Amino acid sequence: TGRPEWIWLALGTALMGLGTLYFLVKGMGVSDPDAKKFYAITTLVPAIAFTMYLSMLLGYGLTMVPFGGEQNPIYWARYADWLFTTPLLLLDLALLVDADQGTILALVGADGIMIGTGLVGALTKVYSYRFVWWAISTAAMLYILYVLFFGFTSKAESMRPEVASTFKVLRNVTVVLWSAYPVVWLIGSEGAGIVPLNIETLLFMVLDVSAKVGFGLILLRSRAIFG
Ligand SMILES: *C/C=C(C)/C=C/C=C(C)/C=C/C1=C(C)CCCC1(C)C
Numbered sequence: 667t668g669r670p671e672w673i674w675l676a677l678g679t680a681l682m683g684l685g686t687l688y689f690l691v692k693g694m695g696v697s698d699p700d701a702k703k704f705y706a707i708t709t710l711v712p713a714i715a716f717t718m719y720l721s722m723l724l725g726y727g728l729t730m731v732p733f734g735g736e737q738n739p740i741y742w743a744r745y746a747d748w749l750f751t752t753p754l755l756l757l758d759l760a761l762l763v764d765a766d767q768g769t770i771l772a773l774v775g776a777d778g779i780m781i782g783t784g785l786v787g788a789l790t791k792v793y794s795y796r797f798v799w800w801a802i803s804t805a806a807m808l809y810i811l812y813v814l815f816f817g818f819t820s821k822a823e824s825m826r827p828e829v830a831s832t833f834k835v836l837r838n839v840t841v842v843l844w845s846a847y848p849v850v851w852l853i854g855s856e857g858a859g860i861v862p863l864n865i866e867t868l869l870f871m872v873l874d875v876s877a878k879v880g881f882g883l884i885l886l887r888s889r890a891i892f893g
Pocket residue numbers: 748751752755780781783784785800803804805807844845847848851874877878
């Protein structure tokens with residue numbers, strides 16, 4: 667069907683795949699138990715993204731939703747990806763600063779809410795109500811970011827310098843990249859329809875690769891994953 671955005675879905679497919687393979691090869695060679703746990707989690711992240719990117723490329727995960735007097739193209743496949751990838755990334759961060767079980771539960775719960783309401787909003791047929799779900803989803807995102815910035819950064823002060831320094835960089839990459847998603851959603855096809863789907867796809871691809879492969883390289887190349 668040659669939709670304008672396929673080139674970005676194809677490029678995201680390739681980068682997510684390359685990233686996954688490389689992390690897989692690199693993780694299989696490691697013998698430290700703790701480093702292996704980080705490797706399995708981190709490898710799974712782009713592996714999942716890969717499948718969803720490839721599916722969308724082949725014409726799946728796309729549904730037309732009515733609102734604003736138009737049949738708007740909505741890629742729901744993105745939420746099936748993010749439902750599992752975002753909490754795994756949070757787990758990597760939590761294991762890094764040795765966060766408590768209660769903290770992890772709250773972050774994942776908040777993450778599930780962010781993705782769930784995000785998807786409900788992306789499927790809502792009442793234009794103005796789309797933004798109510800988006801508002802609720804962004805709020806949950808802000809809760810998560812608050813915890814990583816105020817809770818975790820504090821927690822990282824119990825760890826060695828290199829562990830705290832690695833966490834700060836990953837914390838900063840996450841805060842910057844994650845905060846951008848709601849904005850893209852708002853001005854894109856899911857929201858105000860200002861930015862075209864092809865460009866929107868290009869934007870999500872850059873953020874996704876960065877948030878997963880970029881994040882992954884930073885973490886797995888560090889000495890912080892060793893027990
Ligand atoms: C690999 C994917 C990552 C790191 C995805 C992060 C996605 C977000 C932080 C998404 C946030 C959203 C909102 C705040 C509100 C509207 C809908 C979402 C799900 C796009």
